[PDB]
């Protein structure tokens with residue numbers, strides 16, 4: 001296997017605006033097929049990248065900054081990864097649309113899966129309205145990220161390399177003196193399988209495919225043989241002996257990570273998907289499913305000279321392998337201090353979400369289910385509805401709902417709602433067999449409130465097997481057509497995604 005920790009961690013450059021005034025910031029980002037070396041010992045890999053980079057440029061904005069991004073497709077007319085033509089029913093082969101994950105965004109700038117476009121916008125999907133997306137950024141400071149969201153192609157376009165970081169800085173948070181600038185570093189984690197010739201491998205069918213299966217065929221899960229951070233295989237990062245802030249993003253298709261430091265050191269979590277936690281949390285490990293973000297401080301002050309592995313204990317399709325996927329990256333505490341560490345790790349960070357006292361307008365019960373298709377493949381469904389079925393999740397703008405998510409399946413699903421961030425209320429285990437036979441919900445234990453890591457704002461949430469997860473969301477400030485879905489991309493594409501209409505009655 002590839003030798004670990006021989007390439008330095010890339011830190012994507014921050015994107016520069018094409019035009020900027022006090023009133024408007026304007027960016028242009030063009031999707032390009034390019035080649036990049038992913039490891040010292042590999043030939044360059046053909047990838048799809050925003051501005052031809054993998055990951056894409058980091059975009060940094062201020063809270064309330066009036067931002068526009070013209071996302072453009074300049075990709076080849078043929079994909080290089082295997083397309084399954086049976087999962088969606090003349091359209092172009094390569095369709096793209098950019099979604100700002102976590103963005104409080106008007107609906108026509110949200111990257112609806114059917115708002116896709118081909119090269120130069122030559123062909124556009126039925127929900128396409130505009131070329132230049134508008135991000136008003138009227139939301140809490142947080143780690144966001146942007147990625148492709150095209151109908152029935154999301155798992156492929158994201159795997160190809162179409163992911164990047166987007167950070168909203170709220171100037172009100174500056175007084176906290178959290179590690180900043182060079183000491184504030186995004187970590188986009190993506191698992192990949194790479195052929196000897198350097199080319200990406202993505203499966204064209206399940207292992208030992210039934211003769212009944214189409215070719216190519218979608219698979220329900222992808223587990224990569226190798227882990228990359230910021231577009232390099234098992235990299236090292238030279239750090240100063242001081243406090244760093246890391247914006248940890250799971251940009252993988254399926255894989256969940258459970259992260260720790262191999263010297264037994266602690267993380268201090270300061271933020272979740274939706275921004276700063278009300279109080280900092282000391283953690284020895286944390287779970288990170290697709291699309292979740294952790295905003296953490298690691299304090300290297302006492303560890304000068306040491307090499308510390310960011311390790312992983314979560315399996316993907318089996319037990320973790322000590323020599324491969326148990327490793328994410330390596331910190332080397334060998335960079336001389338550039339200046340005094342004047343950063344802080346404060347306990348008191350932000351207002352509790354619980355200060356809010358919104359009236360519960362609706363309690364929405366939702367189930368994670370699915371069926372089997374004519375080929376014998378599993379089709380994962382929210383409420384046993386297809387993406388194309390008439391909309392059923394129709395919250396009213398400005399109102400608050402409790403969503404009760406029932407998971408009788410064998411696995412976790414990282415459920416994501418567009419537009420909003422939400423509070424986690426509790427998780428409660430239930431009798432799966434009884435639910436499957438009668439549809440009746442019989443609890444097998446008391447409700448468990450969220451751990452401190454989940455006492456802030458979330459937008460992607462692990463709904464574990466055999467549990468009912470309750471979340472509370474206020475639907476706004478915008479009305480329009482959004483979505484909600486499982487963020488395991490293999491599930492999302494077939495067919496665990498539903499429209500979500502926020503109505504203005």
Ligand SMILES: [Cu+2]
Pocket residue numbers: 099101147291487
């Ligand atoms: Cu996303």
Ligand SMILES: [Cu+2]
Pocket residue numbers: 099100101102416417418419
């Ligand atoms: Cu999203």
Ligand SMILES: [Cu+2]
Pocket residue numbers: 380412413414486487488491492496
């Ligand atoms: Cu799923």
Ligand SMILES: [Cu+2]
Pocket residue numbers: 099149416418483485
């Ligand atoms: Cu989405």
